[PDB]
């Protein structure tokens, strides 16, 4: 009942043991730093929200998140970028209702 290594199928290719070298330092670009989180949080207070974000808020407020996704998808560009944007404007909108009652 000996199997052979096969150039095709489910677990294919030459027999190779995989070494765990530390992942490259370029891989962690765009990873959210504790300080740079503070700076975007800081300027969010100073600047506020863009007119397309403020309209996206007021479609999430009345509960119309598909029509808020279809809105942002037109404005910001793609579907992955819109789905992220809506879930950020759903986070900073649900955070206002926490600050509302107390």
């Amino acid at each position: 009942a000996l199997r052979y290594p096969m150039a095709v199928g489910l677990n294919k290719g030459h027999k190779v043991t995989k070494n765990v070298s530390k992942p490259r330092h370029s891989r962690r670009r765009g990873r959210l730093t504790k300080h740079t989180k503070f700076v975007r949080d800081m300027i969010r207070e100073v600047c506020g929200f863009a007119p397309y974000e403020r309209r996206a808020m007021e479609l999430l407020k009345v509960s119309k998140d598909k029509r808020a996704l279809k809105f942002i998808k037109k404005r910001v560009g793609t579907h992955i970028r819109a789905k992220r944007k809506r879930e950020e404007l759903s986070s900073v909108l649900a955070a206002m209702r926490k600050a509302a009652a107390k």
């Binding site: 009942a1 000996l2 052979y4 096969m6 095709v8 199928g9 489910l10 294919k12």
Partner: peptide
């Protein structure tokens, strides 16, 4: 007898359909 009994062609065609 393992090497003699091993079906190389049958084993390849099974592997294709499985993947």
């Amino acid at each position: 007898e393992e090497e003699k009994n091993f079906k190389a062609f049958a084993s390849l065609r099974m592997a294709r359909a499985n993947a």
